Structure formats: C-alpha cells, structure tokens
Amino acid sequence: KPMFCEIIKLANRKRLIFNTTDERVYDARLNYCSTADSTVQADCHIYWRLKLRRTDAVFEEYTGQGYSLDTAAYPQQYTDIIRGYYSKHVSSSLAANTQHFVNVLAMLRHAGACIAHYCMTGKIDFDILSKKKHKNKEVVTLSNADSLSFLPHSALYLPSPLRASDPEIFNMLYLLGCACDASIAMDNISAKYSMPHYNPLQLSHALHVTIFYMLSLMDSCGYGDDAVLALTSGLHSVTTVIAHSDEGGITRDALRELSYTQPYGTMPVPIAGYFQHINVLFTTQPAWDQFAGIWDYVILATAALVHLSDPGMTVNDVTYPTTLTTKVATVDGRNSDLAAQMMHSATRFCDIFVENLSTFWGVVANPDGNASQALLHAFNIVACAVEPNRHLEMNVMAPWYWVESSALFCDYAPFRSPISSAGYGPQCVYGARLVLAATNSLEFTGEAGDYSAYRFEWTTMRHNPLFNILNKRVGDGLANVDFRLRPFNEWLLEGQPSRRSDTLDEYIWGSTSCDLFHPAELTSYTAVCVRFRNYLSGADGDVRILNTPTREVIEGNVVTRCDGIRCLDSNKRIQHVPEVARRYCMMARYLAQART
Amino acid sequence: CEIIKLANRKRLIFNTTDERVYDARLNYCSTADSTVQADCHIYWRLKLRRTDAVFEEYTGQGYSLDTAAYPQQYTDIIRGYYSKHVSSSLAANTQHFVNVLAMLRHAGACIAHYCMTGKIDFDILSKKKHKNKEVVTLSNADSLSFLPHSALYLPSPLRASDPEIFNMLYLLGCACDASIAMDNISNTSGAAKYSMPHYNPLQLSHALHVTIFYMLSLMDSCGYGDDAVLALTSGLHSVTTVIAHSDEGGITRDALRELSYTQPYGTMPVPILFTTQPAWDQFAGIWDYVILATAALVHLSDPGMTVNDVTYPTTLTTKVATVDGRNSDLAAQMMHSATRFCDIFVENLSTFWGVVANPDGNASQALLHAFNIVACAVEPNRHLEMNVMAPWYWVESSALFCDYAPFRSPISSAGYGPQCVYGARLVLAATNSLEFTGEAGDYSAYRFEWTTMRHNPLFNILNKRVGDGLANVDFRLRPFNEWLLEGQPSDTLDEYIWGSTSCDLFHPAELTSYTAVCVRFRNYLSRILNTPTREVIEGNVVTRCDGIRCLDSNKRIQHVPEVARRYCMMARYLAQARTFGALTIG
C-alpha cells in the first residue's frame, strides 16, 4: 500500500498559481519544550515553497531519446489476461510462455507533468493532456488483436475489454498515448476515435486512477522502481520546490533531465485489488482543493525522501552527512573534482534512494538496480556539462539535503536510512511527541565568575536542537552563547562570512526560510568548548539573571510536537536566503587527513 | 449553579462601546458593633471584543492533542459502524482517536457571541463558509480510497438518533476546517453539497447547547476533559471581553485569546440543564455565569510567594526600563509564575467542570504555551508596560460560588480570596495581629503587623460609611517600612488606597509592606467622631451578599485607579532575595 497521510490536503489552498513570479508556501509549526523546565520553549516555522517553473513547461518538445525498458514482460496471470484478448481460434492454440513486453514510463512522466500542472493551476482539459496532438491522431483499426503482429512498429495496444470494463482509463491512456509519439491500436471506433466530454473533476479522477493503474502495471512486471522514478521525474518536471539550501537541488535537476522513449505494449484489464488502499479518502469528481492537496503532499514527500535517505560518511567512527570538499578553485560555475566526489557519493545514494522511493509508494524495490543506474546516468548528464550550474559554484557542498523532512511523514520507520539513526533526518514526527536529546554528550568542565563552560563533541548543529529554542527567543537567546575557549575559530560551513573578512548569533545561517538547521551547517570534527552567560554583572556592581537555560536543561531532553500546517502567500522573510561560506578551510584539511 | 441566572437583563449589546454591568451588593458588618456597617457594590463589565470577533480567521496552527483513545464500548460502536459500511473495515482494528478542541473553541466563541449580541444563523456558526464546503461521501468513494485517521467522520446513526447534534457538529466542522466525511449525501442540489433545514435561533441554541456538553462528555470519556473545557472557556473569553477589576492585569484574557488548535478529527458515536428551547435570558444567564465563574476561578487559583515564611500573592518585579511597552525580565518571571499557575488553574478548572484531569497535565502545557506566545511576541502590549505587577487577579471571586470547598486553592488558605460567599454569611478577621501602641490627644496609635490591605478588610467599611471616609485614619511612616503598589504619587489612608471605582473591594496585594506599620486613628476633632472603638478594630467582620442586579454602563466605574508602578526599594529587596538568596531579607 502507498502512504498518503493527508498533511497538505488539510492546508486548504485558495489561490491559483498562474505565473513564475509568485509561489505557494506551506508552513508548519514545531513546538520545542525542554523536559527539565517548560519555560524553555519555542516555535520553529518550517516553510516549504512551490513554484511553477514555466507557463508552458508541460508543452515541451518530446525528443524520444532516453531510458528505455525493453525487457518488462508480464507474469503468468496477466499473460492469461492477454491471451484472453485474442480470437477464440487463436486463444485456443497459443503458447503459454509468450511474453508481451510493455513500456509506459513516458506516459507516466507526462501524466506526472499534467498532474503537477493541475496542482499548480486549476486548468486541465484534453488540450493539456495530449500536447495539442489529439487533433490529428490516426489510430489504426484491427479486430481481436491477432492482427497486432501485422504492425511493424511496437504498438500501444488498447483493447476493447479495457474500454468495456471502465471507459475513463481507456480514454486517459488514449490521451497519454496521443501525448507521446506512440502508435495506438484499438479494436472498434463507432476514422478518428471520439471520447465523451469530461469536466475536469472526472478527468482528474481518471488521471489519478490511471496513475495507479500504470504503477500496478509496472509493479506486476517487477519494474516498479522505474515507474515511481518516472512519476517523480514527471512531478518535478513542471513544478519547482524551491530549495531550502542554495547548495542543494542537483537531485531536482537530475529528475528534470530524465526522459523516456516511445511507449508500447498491451494494456490488460487490471486484477481486482492490486493495491489494498491508498490510506486517504478520495472520491469521484473531487474538487481542485483535495486533489491538489493530496498530490502536493506526494510532491513534497518525494522531495523530502532525498534528505530522509542518504548515505552518511563515517569520519573517525562518528557518522556525518556527506560533505564534499574540493581543492581546485571554481571556474565559471563548474567544478570537475566536486563532480567526481558527488558521483562517488551518488553511486551509493541512488540505491537507497530508489529503495526508499519504492518503500514510500506501494511498490516493492527491485533488488536488481535499474532505476538507480538510470538516475546515476541522469546525474552524469547534469554534471560534466558546458552550461554554468548555480548548484556547483562552491568548494564545499552537502548534496542530499534539498528540503526538510521533519514534520512531513506520519511514520518514518519503514524507510531505511543510516542518517536517521545517526541523529539527523526526522526532527519531529507528525501526530506524536518525539523526545530526543537536547545537546551532544558533554562534560561540565567549569564555571567562571559570570560564565559556564561545557565541552561538546559537536557532531553538527542538527544534533543540538536546543539552539533552535535559543534561536527564536527575541532577546538573550544566542547573544549570550559565545566561542572563545577554543584556540582556533575554524568551522566547516561557516555561518556568515560577510562579518569577518564572537557569539553564536554572529556566525549562524539566516535560516529565515526554515528555522531548523541544515544537517551540515556549522559542522566540526573536533571537540568544542562552549560557554554560556548566565548572569550579567554591571559596571556599578550589581548583577542580574539573564534568560539563559540552566545546567539541568542541557542534559534534559527536548520534547518536539507538531502544530498545524497551513498555506500562505510569499513574503520577504522566506525569500531571504543565508550567505554561506563554501571554501577550503582548516577543518577541510582535517577532513582530508581524517579516517573517512 | 444559578447565582447570575435568577438576575434578569433585557439589554442587547450590538457594539463594542456598550457593556453589561453585573452588580453585587455586599454588606460588611462588624461582629462586636452592629451599627458600623457598609454596602459595597462590585461591578463586572462584559462587552464585545469586536463585532467580527466570532469571524476571526481560523489558522489551523495550534495545540495538537494525541493519544485521545475511546473506551471499549465506544470502540465497539465505532467498529460496528466501520464493519457496516464498505471501505471502512480496515480502520476497525486500530485504536481510534478524537480531537474536537477547535470545534469546542468555536462553540464557546459562538455561544459567547449569542449571549452577548443575540443573533445566530448559519453564516455566524460556520464563519459564512458552509455554502461552499464539499462533503466527501463514503458511498461515492473510490475502491482505492480508505477512510483515514484524520478525517472527521459523522455517522448516519448519529443523524438517526439525534439530527440536531449531527447537524451542529457538521456546522462546527465547517467552521473549523476539516475533512467532513458522511455516509451518503442526498444529491438534491449539489453532488456533494449538504443542504440543511432552517432553524429558528431557539432550537439552534438548544441544539448547540446540547452538542457542547455532548463533546465535553465525549472528551471526558476519552480522558482529556480538562483540555476540552479549557478550549471551551478559551472561546468564551475569546469573544466576550470581561473588563478586569485591577487595571492592566488581564494577561490571562490575552493568553486565552492566543490559544488555537489543530484541525478537528475523529468519529462521533451515539452517546452512552434545560429541556425546552429556552429564551435568550436564561441561556445568556447560565453562560454568563460560566464566563464569570472562570473569571473568578483565575483569581481563586493563585500560587503564593513565601517571604520570610509568610504567604503573599504572586507579585512580580523587574528593574529594566520598558521598551515598546514590554519587559522581557518581567515576562520571564511571568512565565515561571505561569508554569505554577497553569498546573493549579487546570486542576481548578477540572474541579469546576466536574471532569477529572489527566495525570500528565498536557492541558496546562497548552495553556503555558499560550502564555509563551503572548509573552514572547512583539506587539505594543498595554499589560506589560509596567515594572511591578500582581498578574493572577483578573476578576474578584467574591459571591460567585455556593461553596469554595472543592476548589484546591493555596491562596485561600491564607486570608486572600473571596470575601463573601453567596447565600451564606462569612465571618473573618477585621485586622491583623495587633498591639496597642498608645493613645494621645485626639489620636490613637495601633501597631499593625502589616501584610496587605485584603487581610485588613475593615477599612472599606470606613471608606463606605457616610461623612468622612478614611480621612481620619493615617500612618506613621518609619524609614524601614516602604510601600509597594501605592495609591497616588502625591498622609491620610485615602491617599494610599487606589480608590478603585470598578469594585469597592481591595486588590490582592493592594498595599504590601513586609514589616509592621503604625496606624493612628483620629477619635476626636478639636468634638467626637464616628471612629470605631478598640473592640470593633480587634473584633471580627461578617460578610454577606445581598442580590445581584444587572445594569448598563456607568461612567463612575469606567475610571481605572492609579497604582504608580515603578522600580522601588521593595523591588530591590525582592531582587536581592531572588539572586543572592533568601537570607538577605531576613
């Protein structure tokens, strides 16, 4: 069964996106409460941003060159369903070991483009679905499918029992065949096939049920990974989830670069109950609201799978998220060595990402890697390219974080990832209270006359959500936290390079887009000494207590809860992006001579 | 009970300027001398927050209640409902949950708007969005579709047993946006549009009244009864503005206004005090008693400061100057005081509504988070402009309860709290511990072991008698003894009391001096005055309530008293006790 926990559907979207300039925002609130005292609490706002890349992004030139799956034969029961489609004279004497190979990934990609276009703007009709190529489509006419062998090209065969079972799947597969350069073969017509007029409600329902039909069709052949990869590539081909880190988003470009050849095959009448249920209530003729909500949710969830699932490098026995550092300087937005490092990390990213993309959907992962190698080749196309890339003009990158997966999945344990076990990944589970560690394992070294010193291992800021709570305080939150006990102020992925050609508020990312920290933000590989300012001693001679958490708050865990999720218009605060120092440093030199 | 229900009011309020003033007449009389006595009028002012106060925008961002499981009988009824209809059978095996807290907040909001304004139709109940609201239909559901865990499911036997509660739960689901899922919708106007019969406001008010207590009984069966009544009172105070007796001290009102909840979900089984469709008067009386009883409850549930093993009301103290009308150092102390206050106020709200509170006390966590929202936000707030406060007095609790026994109060163990019980006579001490310092020409000096003005109620009698009120009584100010929360900036005792016209009673921490004070009376004027004798000063005072009468706005009571809140020497004593230890003030 697929997982569709209805998170984005409850946001109740009102406005329609018609141009590239505006964007749709979904914000969640996470409440952070220290278990030691309930005074120390904060509300972190997570803003996901969605934007339509182009008005005519669906209407794009179909090249027809790309990944092709020429070995996708049916199992025994479907082959029985297909031999039920021949003539009775032919079906009485036909080989049981016959194989009807099928490719439908290009129609999955186009239907993903049409369905995310319907999420972005309320318009959909036969004009969008066929890419203006149903006006002059000439379907060939044959009887009983014994004459299918007569056709020289491999033909998209749409039988008459599929039409007599339910006509909306037949009509929608004819429309998606008209979208691609497929040769369509039918049984009966009444020269050109004429389908009944659909309102966009039934048309969106037909688009929905054919998406799940084609996913069931490919999972029946075992090649469900290619199906869900083609559907994710189709979803991100017309929409653009705006990246949380300016670094990330190369995975979005790899999903944009995926293209497929001309579809072909025979479409059986589907077996009853291949999918048990899709754990969300969906109806015939749904509104734009609920349909756009459920499918915006699957867009954001398959965007969150890249942060939720990635291979973490083990640097000196303690796990860190993959951080790729080059020595050569960047020329014209290009880095060859950094590209080689992201290929070395993508060869292990692609397997676990296609397995968890399958695990997100209803399909099981093919143990033979087919979507993973095609996605790796999509990375190989988007790198080593002559065009300048915005996502590579840097010397330090941390690729797999593209959007935050904190409060977007109701359940996290079916997804496999070592990074979620390493302390990163899900920060707050929706619908539950998540009690996790406040800071790194520490030792109270000493207390000065007006400060208090602690020694952290400092894996990364994301193991320290307590500084989230200190971030959202309007006063005395991070100005009191300062770093002067450590001898060298060397940090990989510095907070703000603009100030320096020292307090934790001075070097930290802006983070106005999302209050939670990047999993490699302000990372270090050595132990750090932090000191807090508990009191304030004036010049005249009096002291006053500042709003600094006490000692037992630091060893006392943090309960995280999730508040509601709503929809907003864009404003300047979320549009602001942090300036990040991405260059070779002393901690990068420690990373080079580390264990890794 | 019915303390304000018997009282009859006919004034209808349609704007935020007009207000409804409840008056309680109080007789204070000494036990030793009957001829010295006084009538104190205490006034409650209720008004509209805004005209569009019930139409405030529902965010969806708010407190999220979890683990709100049903008892075994309800789960059996719900599993019968799910096994009855198709595409619901898989949802029977899991433990079912519920959340109607946003529905209860809007329910309290719209009944407060009905009890204040007096007009209700479907546009007001559902925030005029019911006319465009698609109801998902399980009969029209797809074969792949599944009844999920966060859609509000309204069964057809709920419509069969009691369609008034069914329709009202539908309207409150339209108000606080959710996925309303019914079994089948009659396609007479729209395919999924649910058309409704027209109700006169009496039947609609009765249906809303019974469905509020229906949801309260449901959440009480589920175990979370305190959070349900907390959301209900949050909506009630969210619409009705109750003007505080102490000026600039209604922070709890703004904390209840900053509450919000997540979007409601669950399923509504068949259930396991008027019966008729009432007039506006009786319904408004019982719910205005609910509102003013919670406004008394916020006073009755107050943790106490311990200063040299003496119990005082929680009074808070900063030193830093105000910026943008707010003090963060004051706000942090208010958060600590609220941390104790929420645990004590939720227990008292549970004892008021008759529901048992959960042991973890997450409703107190929601209220404390509301205090964190109102305390750590950037707006020009009138309430936090000051330096020194007594936060947790909002409305005087005297003569609002038949008894004060089940309320667990750590401040009414001392002399603080209600001065009179309604329908009863309450005898209490007129003065503190005393000694007779002496008597001279035309004056008589008593050494008062001074704690506060509320421990010395007798002076209000001296204020409210005819002739001169408290002009004869004055102080001898030594250098050690210093006042806090004074009456006016610029030695008679009338200059030191606030002169609050909203209520004749004194504020808890009206005038606090940790040390003893010397008070001299003027017995003779050189004739003889009406100053009481020594047995009247040391003798007790009985307190009684005599009727409650409603009235319109008076310009006398609308004037707020002056407190002269500034950083003082006693504030420095409290600061030194806070940061250097308690032994520095011993």
Numbering used by the authors:
A (entry chain A): 15 to 204, 210 to 520, 541 to 635
B (entry chain B): 19 to 290, 300 to 517, 541 to 576, 583 to 642
Sentences from the paper on this structure:
LRVs belong to the family Totiviridae of viruses with linear double-stranded RNA (dsRNA) genomes. To protect viral RNAs from degradation, capsid proteins of the L-A totivirus cleave the 5′ caps of host mRNAs, creating decoys to overload the cellular RNA quality control system.
The capsid is spherical in shape, with an outer diameter of 424 Å. The particle is built from 120 copies of capsid protein organized with icosahedral symmetry. The two capsid proteins forming the icosahedral asymmetric unit of LRV1 differ in their structures, despite being identical in their amino acid sequences. The structure of subunit A could be built for residues 15 to 204, 210 to 520, and 541 to 635 out of 742, whereas that of subunit B was determined for residues 19 to 290, 300 to 517, 541 to 576, and 583 to 642. The two subunits have a similar distribution of secondary structure elements and can be divided into the α-domain, which is formed by α-helices 1 to 13 and 16, and the β-domain, which contains β-strands A-L and α-helices 14 and 15. Structural differences between A and B subunits in the LRV1 capsid, which reflect their nonequivalent interactions with the remainder of the capsid, are located primarily at protein-protein interfaces. The largest interface in the LRV1 capsid between subunits A and B has a buried surface area of 2,000 Å2, whereas the remaining interfaces are smaller than 1,200 Å2. The capsids of LRV1 contain pores with a diameter of 10 Å along the 5-fold axes.
